[PDB]
Amino acid sequence: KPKLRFIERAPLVPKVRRSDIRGPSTEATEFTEGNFAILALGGGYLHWGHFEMMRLTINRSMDPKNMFAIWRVPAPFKPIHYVTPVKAGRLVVEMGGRCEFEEVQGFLDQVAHKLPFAAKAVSRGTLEKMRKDQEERERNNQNPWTFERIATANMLGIRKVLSPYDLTHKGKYWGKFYMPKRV
Amino acid sequence: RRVMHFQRQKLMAVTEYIPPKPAIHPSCLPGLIRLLRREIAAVFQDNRMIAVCQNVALSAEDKLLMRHQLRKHKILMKVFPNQVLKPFLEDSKYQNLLPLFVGHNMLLVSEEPKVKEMVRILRTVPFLPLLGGCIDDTILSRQGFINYSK
Amino acid sequence: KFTRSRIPEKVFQASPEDHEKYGGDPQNPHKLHIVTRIKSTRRRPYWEKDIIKMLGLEKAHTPQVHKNIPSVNAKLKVVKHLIRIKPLKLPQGLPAEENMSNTCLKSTGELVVQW
């Protein structure tokens, strides 16, 4: 099935329970049986219309004998309608097959801009490159003062302004928004 | 994005990333290829007489007809990159051949001179002049080629 | 919620770079702190206000000498963002009874027995 399978609008059997938007995503943060994908640069909610347009715009410019695309986010289940929570760093749609990144860059960027939250078209190589250069940034920054250091040491009494979650987010994640430039 | 507390904004500004600054700008600081190599090396011994022209102003059909009239004889027409032909001259020890091949160049490798009839054919098209060649390690200009033909 | 902040102990573990930078020897540490309040306790929690009162730092820019011992240091850690701490330096040793009235606290942190 080298195509994005149709997803149900709502689950047949509702589930009781098991902010899912703020902070980095913990699951589906790494490629699994794919080579390209769409990465969420910020949290948000995916609607059924959003999913349907993902599937449409991916399966339109699709080569089933050379491209296979899979979801990484489940069907809309959270009641509000039904939506899916997505956190920053979460892959949305993965692709694989005998293909090159520029072959998909165009419409992947288009569909990422379509997405309600900030999103990016990321290959395995680009994901590794951005992770490595983020590590390089945090290792070579010439600023003696970092959000992590100041918040942990409660310098200037700054925890009176900050949140308890800021100690773990180290200033990179502020609410649902994610700031990759923030070292 | 909702407005942060001003103290938090000051914290973010002070903790903004500072890239390392190099003192001196690094910028302002200091198998088809081998197939062509071997084929041209073999051709340099296969051919006995060689000539070059500028067969680029011709149309597709005119070039096809010229190729047919050349294949009527045992002569074979060749095109090869100057980018790779320049090393070939020094590899085959052809020093006088350096100021001969630049831009478009079409070789006319042969062993039996039908250059009389080839010049006769070229005459009816008053362009595409003959360019100097080098038969059996002996350079011949256009006048030398004409004398050899006669 | 806003609560007391537990400073991780690694914050108060000096490095050799810190030793070179600030000029204090971890072996033979200084005996006394000179603490001055340099920040208002207004808009600070009641526990910081209380620690400031306990340490006697109600007046800003008025040096107060305290022991460099773990309990005093815990209080100072609670209010470290409101104060400036400098070691008390005794080039001529602690003053004798004869010159107890002729001392002066130099801005460098040195208690000199001549003034």
């Binding site: 100041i150 | - | 000096a14 470290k80």
Partner: peptide, 29 residues
């Protein structure tokens, strides 16, 4: 209305942070 951080404000905060770092060092012994 939005507010912005000036170089003077950043320098003042940095001065305060330096004082606090020295406080950390002197409290470490």
């Amino acid at each position: 209305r939005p507010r912005f951080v000036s170089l003077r404000a950043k320098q003042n905060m940095i001065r305060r942070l330096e004082i606090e770092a020295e406080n950390h060092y002197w409290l470490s012994m």
